[PDB]
Write a protein that binds this ligand. Structure first.
Ligand SMILES: [Zn+2]
Lengths: 192, 190, 61, 93, 424, 564
């Protein structure tokens, strides 16, 4: 009833679907806050209140799939989160290069949200988007080096991965879990 | 002119690091993936080099025998930057070219094509055994044992004629333990 | 492991999906019988996303 | 089937019949608000463009019609056409 | 020496390029492109639900503009041509030439739902109704800048023989009222790098923009990059200009200090308590055509001693004493403005009373946090004077709890006297 | 008239009022395939209706037969149609068998309203006046031609309609005279449909570089056949490029920068994909000027490159690898030389688009790619239908090629364009060397009886490629009188000639009033008189297909007619 490739992991589209439930800041380009001096949003999964009280260019926070729906039309702009600016990503790059073992504390959704917003909101960034793409690429490459170091220390016992992304984890998950399972089964089998 | 060579190298480094189509950094990806499977080369489509900055392609095609080693050097530097945490060893990377320049048939190649990049086709009628060419020679003076080295780019070197500070007329010898070599093969194209 | 079923949570979610479907339908009948369709589109795709999560959850277990 | 037969054993043929009957019982009792047999790719878009890959004439949907003219293209709610993508009459996404 | 120049709110120069903005405000923005011998004008809106963008080829080369909800007003400063364009296009566009003496120019223009207003460099002040009928001509000090919101008009005057001054009016469909006439404006004019000189060649007054709060209070943002708001303008004997945001200090603070330069604030509108603006980066002070998203800055009362913050921080964090001072002042002034709006103009979104109540909560909390430090220095009188300021009686009980924890029974006694008085 | 260009907004608002809902699909677009401008107009219109989230259907249609079929099977829920690139020149209310009383609703008032709109987006003229004045349901998007030109015909139509004695005789004779002189005008395109949609997007406030590029493409597709219309529209496109171009200068080429310049775009064929030599060699205009279909013209082209200081091997390099110094200096090298060969009209400024690092493409090259995809992209009645199905299906290869995500499909288009133009050129030198063009007194005749690549010319656009290649050659000669031409080609499979009636036109650089195509009604008159079996359902009604045995009687009756 569940396909083999979905049995013990998430598809990248499911990882996207998870990340799309996160709140994001938008500048509305419609006004829905009816003045004191008609259809309302009436949602059941998320905060209905913000969308019914939008005013144009008063920034407000909504769930990301609604922000993408409004940005498919010209009816909002999505404010790129503070970490995704050039200066912040450069600080994270310096952290990654300065601490060879720790992963830098980017948010768990960083690669997923970078991909989403670089595609669907390429015009909304204050910084030039080619630099943001370049530095997101720098971060992924440096973090992949750190992953390849970490996998030399797989155990039958456990492992710790402090600030690894949801996407990076989900990409590694079948390999790490299967190999550690087999190391366990070798070790436990040897016990009397 | 070493500053100019450094700017050529940095131009190629920027080409590897910056060239992108449809949201993918194709040469960063290709170089990383090549490093993972431990083949130290990069296949470059010169349509992309032209599309990036035709000044670089003009420099490359004017004198490839000088420019190709600089491009190889740039690839090594980017390879280290995208696969090693520096401030916590890889060889000289081979450049490989893809092209769609108009073919010159093998009979029409003559003296005006000397040292130009050329595209041609034919039938391989023989393939010689492999042979070892030096990339890095560790070099010693026979009398004073002054040691030096030659780093070689295989696009056309010799041992120095006399000692680089009597010491004999023709004194240098190779230290075969520290010297580095590469595979070379000869083919005949009909 | 097969984790224990969220009985009360699933009961109340299925009630909401029913009532929200009836609401979206009632508004559609109202349109057929101040007008802007955009909140209606958000409600429609909300039920699509939510029904996807329930579908995926049940199919997995 | 919840939406080559010679290769099955006859036990497998009647097994498959019973398992399909079971699936169609699950998406008919309680929980019927969700078509439990629907897709498990998450819904990426609410409206999609779809090119008609085979002709099927004028058919109704809940508040309208499609005339499935060969190599015509719609722009339409995905939830109103998914059944026809699975049945191979519509092309895109 | 001085030259009059045309102004429109937050309009930009051409600089080294062939397109510029005529204006931008809470409604939208207008841009013009030097399309060879003629100009391509585009009018763009932030509320795409209400209004639709449009463009036209302009043969006169309008250099003045103004943009309210109802229509766009255009002007050509050197020829006296003006044009007005309703946004519905159910009412007609219309065009007029207003007379100019030799060397006279239109310096600013503005529009209201029942009026169109034109001010010239010789200080003539011409009013037309919204259909172009001439209604009045005055003479005033030359109107270097001018805007309106609904029926309220706010104009800035200057000459070598009058100095900098302003007027505020509420013209209405009836009961045409004038709140202040040519009172001196306390804004600072620019000092006499070349991008700055280019900007002041375009705009010698150095008014980057000029507008109203969403609740209808006049605002201006001068060459000091300090947002000024005129408080209690509805009663002239109490009116006072409040420097509600030193944006240089706030840019310095939010960037971690480090002598941060080559980032500039381009103001659009204040809304309630939060300046919408473009943060321009680089040598040029003004935004480029692909208009960046207007970032938001909350207002900050200027109580931040830069030397003290340098000593503390050597990313910048604020000592809790300074933070409580700014919180108390900001909450007090914003609560006053909300109270005046609700008394005179009344609610418009229907939640301003809840906002004002929560704001009084922040005010009392800031006073209690100051009171705690005053009690930590064991000063009974500073503590008691702070105790007098609190609004909620229930909040004033917390001052008793603090003065108990700070072992000041004198303060406890005095506060209980205040409780007994406040009970009335 | 029916909707003037000032009030396209009102028709679009009526579309959104009547035929838009989240609930249902309600809007159908019929677009004439084998028409680049109609394609680009439909693409712009579909992007508009996507952004406004309007549920709609696009149907590509070959000709009037398929139109009447597809209209007949529309459900009453469809309360708006858009007819793109056809239908303006035929009485649609009669042809589609409309009775307005079958569609009328809610009269109250001296007024009516109707359960279905039929909006017509067509650039062909003369309009049928039943569409423009008679119908209450047909709603034409007028470029201004009616208000500019047709006041007398308006008055004549309404007075004749009113006029159900000496005065009666005089009036009815007069206005029948006016109308029968307005009809029997030759057919002609006066606008680009894509520019009409662009003016609508200007009214709504929807212009952007994507919609502008589509407008540029649809307009550029007119340039070969309708040079005057392209020259009329080109200034407005320059205005819009400057208005929508960003303000940055010294803009470094960056993988996210879409740029759309006005710059020198020579009249050579696929310059930035061909070699230089091939882009001269396969150009219609260069062939016409140099008479390149013979060895002397070939010698002249070699002479030109030698005089330019370009080695022939360099001239034959594919343009990307072709020498960078030559690519920089090319404008100077042309300026110094092309007047010397009379090729001075090669110099032109045109719209060039370059996106990121993936090359540069002019509107000229891009429409060549799109046309090649339309032409060669993917019992007699059934075989004919299965051929027309291939062309209806080729529409979606041109459509998908408009998207930057699918530039590999555009490169397929480029390759097919080169090989198509090669086939046209070889057929052309066959025609001119074997002197196929028989000079009948009224018009020139050319009939392809046999040869290689004959099975391409059963496509109307490929036949029109060859026709335009011939017409440039005849136009740029001094000895020949400018006369209309008939080009015909046998299909050995269907045993029918496909026949095209082609206008002449002046030399490419000269400037006079336009030349109209009167094969459109002459073919109709011969069809109406004859017992022959001839199809006349193509939207470009100057094209017909006819059985092999009937052609020579048809052409004899045509050359006896005075109508050409
Ligand atoms: Zn020595």
């Amino acid at each position: 009833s569940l396909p083999a490739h979905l049995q013990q992991t998430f598809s990248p589209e499911e990882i996207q679907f998870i990340v799309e439930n996160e709140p994001i800041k938008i500048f509305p380009r419609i006004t829905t806050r009816q003045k004191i001096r008609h259809t309302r949003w009436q949602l059941i999964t998320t905060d209905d209140k913000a969308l019914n009280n939008m005013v144009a260019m008063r920034s407000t926070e909504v769930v990301l799939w609604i922000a993408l729906l409004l940005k498919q039309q010209s009816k909002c702009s999505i404010v790129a989160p503070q970490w995704l600016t050039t200066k912040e990503l450069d600080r994270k790059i310096q952290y990654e290069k300065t601490h060879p073992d720790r992963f830098s504390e980017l948010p768990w959704n960083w690669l997923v949200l970078a991909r989403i917003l670089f595609n669907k909101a390429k015009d909304d960034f204050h910084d030039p988007i080619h630099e943001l793409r370049g530095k997101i690429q720098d971060l992924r490459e440096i973090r992949q080096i750190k992953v390849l170091k970490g996998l030399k220390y797989l155990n039958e016992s456990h492992l710790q991965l402090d600030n690894l992304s949801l996407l990076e984890i989900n990409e590694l998950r079948p390999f790490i879990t299967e190999i550690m399972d087999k190391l366990r089964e070798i070790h436990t089998a040897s016990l009397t | 002119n070493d500053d100019d060579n450094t700017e050529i190298i940095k131009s190629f480094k920027n080409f590897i690091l910056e060239f992108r189509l449809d949201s993918q950094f194709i040469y960063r990806d290709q170089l990383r993936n090549n490093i993972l499977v431990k083949n130290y080369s990069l296949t470059v489509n010169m349509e992309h080099l032209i599309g990036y900055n035709e000044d670089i392609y003009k420099k490359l095609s004017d004198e490839p025998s000088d420019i190709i080693p600089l491009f190889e050097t740039a690839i090594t530097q980017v390879a280290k930057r995208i696969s090693i945490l520096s401030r916590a060893s890889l060889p000289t990377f081979q450049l490989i070219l893809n092209s769609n320049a108009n073919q010159i048939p093998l009979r029409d190649l003559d003296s005006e094509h000397v040292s130009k990049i050329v595209r041609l086709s034919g039938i391989i009628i023989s393939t010689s055994v492999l042979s070892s060419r030096a990339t890095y020679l560790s070099i010693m003076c026979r009398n004073c044992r002054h040691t030096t080295s030659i780093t070689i780019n295989n696009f056309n070197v010799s041992l120095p004629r006399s000692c680089l500070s009597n010491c004999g007329p023709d004194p240098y010898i190779i230290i075969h333990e520290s010297s580095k070599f590469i595979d070379q093969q000869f083919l005949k194209l009909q | 492991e097969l984790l224990p079923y969220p009985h009360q949570l699933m009961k109340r979610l299925l009630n909401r999906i029913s009532m929200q479907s009836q609401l979206i339908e009632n508004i559609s009948m109202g349109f057929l019988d101040n007008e802007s369709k955009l909140p209606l589109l958000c409600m429609e795709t909300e039920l699509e996303r939510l029904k996807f999560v329930i579908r995926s959850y049940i199919r997995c277990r | 089937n919840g939406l080559d037969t010679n290769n099955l054993s006859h036990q497998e043929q009647e097994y498959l019949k019973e398992y399909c009957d079971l699936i169609t019982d699950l998406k008919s009792g309680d929980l019927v608000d969700i078509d439990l047999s629907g897709s498990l790719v998450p819904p990426s878009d609410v409206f999609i463009d779809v090119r008609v890959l085979k002709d099927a004439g004028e058919i109704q949907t809940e508040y309208g019609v499609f005339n499935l003219i060969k190599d015509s293209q719609f722009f339409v709610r995905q939830s109103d056409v998914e059944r026809l993508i699975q049945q191979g009459y519509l092309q895109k996404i | 020496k001085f030259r009059y120049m045309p102004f429109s709110p937050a309009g930009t120069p051409f600089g080294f390029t062939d397109r510029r903005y005529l204006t931008m405000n809470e409604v939208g923005y207008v841009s013009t492109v030097k399309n060879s011998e003629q100009y391509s004008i585009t009018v763009s809106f932030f509320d795409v639900g209400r209004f639709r963008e449009y463009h036209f080829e302009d043969l006169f080369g309008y250099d003045l503009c103004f943009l309210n909800e109802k229509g766009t007003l255009f002007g050509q400063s050197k020829t006296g041509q003006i044009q007005y364009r309703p946004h519905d296009s159910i009412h007609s566009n219309w065009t007029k030439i207003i007379p100019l003496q030799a060397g006279e120019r239109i310096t600013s223009v503005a529009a209201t739902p029942v009026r169109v207003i034109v001010g010239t460099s010789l200080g003539y002040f011409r009013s037309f109704n919204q259909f172009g009928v001439p209604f009045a001509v005055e003479k005033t000090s030359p109107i270097v800048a001018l805007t309106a919101q609904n029926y309220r008009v706010f104009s800035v005057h200057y000459s070598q023989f009058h100095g900098l001054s302003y007027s505020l009016s509420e013209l209405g469909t009836s009961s045409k009222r004038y709140y202040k006439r040519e009172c001196p404006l306390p804004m600072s004019l620019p000092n006499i790098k070349d991008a700055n000189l280019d900007y002041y060649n375009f705009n010698p007054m150095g008014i980057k923009s000029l507008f109203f709060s969403s609740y209808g209070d006049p605002c201006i943002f001068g060459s000091d990059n300090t947002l000024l708001l005129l408080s209690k303008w509805r009663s002239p004997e109490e009116s006072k200009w409040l420097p509600i945001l030193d944006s240089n200090m706030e840019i310095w603070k939010m960037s971690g200090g480090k002598e941060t330069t080559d980032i500039h604030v381009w103001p659009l509108a204040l809304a309630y308590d939060t300046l919408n603006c473009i943060l321009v980066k680089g040598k040029h002070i003004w935004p480029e055509f692909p208009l960046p998203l207007p970032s938001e800055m909350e207002i900050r009362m200027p109580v931040f001693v830069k030397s003290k913050l340098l000593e503390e921080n050597k990313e910048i964090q604020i000592p809790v004493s300074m933070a409580a001072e700014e919180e108390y002042l900001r909450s007090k002034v914003l609560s006053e403005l909300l109270t005046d709006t609700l008394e005179n103009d009344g609610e418009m979104y229907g939640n301003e009373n809840e906002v004002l109540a929560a704001l009084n909560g922040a005010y009392d909390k800031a006073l209690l946090r100051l009171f705690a430090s005053a009690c930590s220095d064991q000063n009974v009188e500073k503590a008691l004077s702070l105790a007098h300021e609190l609004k909620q009686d229930r909040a004033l009980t917390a001052a008793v709890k603090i003065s108990e924890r700070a072992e000041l029974p004198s303060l406890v006694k005095k506060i209980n006297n205040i409780r007994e008085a406040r009970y009335e | 008239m029916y909707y003037g260009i000032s009030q396209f907004s009102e028709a679009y608002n009526k579309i959104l009022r009547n035929s838009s809902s989240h609930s249902s699909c309600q809007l159908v677009i019929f677009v004439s395939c084998l028409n680049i401008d109609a394609l680009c107009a439909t693409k712009m219109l579909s992007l508009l209706f996507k952004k406004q989230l309007v549920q709609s259907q696009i149907v590509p249609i070959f000709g009037y037969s398929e139109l009447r079929r597809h209209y007949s099977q529309l459900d009453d829920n469809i309360n708006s149609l858009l007819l793109v690139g056809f239908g303006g020149v035929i009485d649609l209310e009669a042809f589609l068998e409309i009775d307005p009383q079958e569609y009328v609703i809610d009269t109250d008032s001296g007024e009516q309203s109707f359960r279905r709109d039929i909006y017509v987006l067509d650039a062909h003229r003369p309009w049928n006046l039943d569409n423009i004045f008679g119908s209450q349901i047909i709603q034409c998007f007028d470029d201004g031609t009616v208000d500019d030109t047709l006041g007398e015909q308006k008055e004549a139509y309404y007075k004749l309609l009113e006029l159900d004695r000496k005065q009666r005789k005089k009036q009815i004779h007069e206005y029948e005279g006016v109308l029968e002189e307005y009809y029997s005008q030759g057919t002609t395109v006066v606008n680009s449909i894509s520019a009409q949609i662009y003016s609508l997007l200007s009214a709504i406030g929807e212009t952007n570089l994507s919609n502008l590029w589509l407008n540029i493409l649809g307009t550029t597709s007119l340039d070969i056949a309708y040079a005057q219309v392209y020259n009329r529209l080109y200034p407005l496109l320059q205005d819009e490029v400057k208005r929508l171009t960003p303000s940055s200068r010294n803009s470094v080429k960056t993988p996210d920068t879409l740029t759309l310049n006005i710059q020198p775009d020579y009249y050579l064929f696929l310059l930035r994909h061909s070699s230089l030599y091939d882009s001269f060699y396969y150009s219609n205009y260069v062939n016409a000027k140099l008479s390149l279909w013979n060895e002397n013209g070939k010698k002249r082209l070699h002479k030109m490159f030698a005089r330019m200081g370009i080695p022939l091997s360099t001239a034959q390099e594919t343009w990307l690898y072709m020498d960078h110094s030559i690519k920089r200096e090319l404008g100077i090298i042309f300026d110094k030389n092309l007047d010397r060969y009379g090729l001075q009209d090669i110099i032109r400024d045109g719209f060039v688009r370059t996106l990121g690092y993936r090359g540069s493409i002019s509107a000229s090259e891009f429409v060549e790619a799109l046309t090649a995809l339309l032409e060669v992209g993917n019992n007699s009645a059934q075989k004919l239908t299965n051929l027309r199905k291939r062309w209806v299906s080729n529409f979606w290869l041109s459509w998908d090629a408009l998207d930057d995500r699918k530039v590999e499909l555009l490169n397929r288009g480029i390759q097919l364009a080169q090989d198509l133009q090669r086939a046209i050129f070889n057929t052309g030198v066959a025609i001119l060397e074997k002197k196929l063009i028989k000079h009948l007194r009224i018009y020139r005749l050319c009939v392809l009886q046999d040869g290689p690549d004959l099975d391409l010319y059963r496509n109307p656009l490929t036949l029109l490629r060859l026709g335009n290649w011939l017409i440039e050659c005849c136009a740029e000669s001094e000895d020949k009188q400018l006369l209309p031409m008939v080009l015909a080609s046998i299909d050995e499979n269907t045993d029918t000639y496909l026949v095209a009636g082609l206008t002449p036109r002046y030399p490419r650089g000269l400037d006079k009033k336009p030349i109209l195509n009167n094969f459109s009604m002459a073919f109709q008159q011969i069809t109406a008189e004859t017992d022959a079996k001839v199809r006349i359902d193509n939207f470009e009604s100057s094209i017909i297909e006819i059985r092999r045995e009937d052609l020579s009687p048809f052409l004899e009756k045509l050359t006896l007619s005075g109508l050409l």
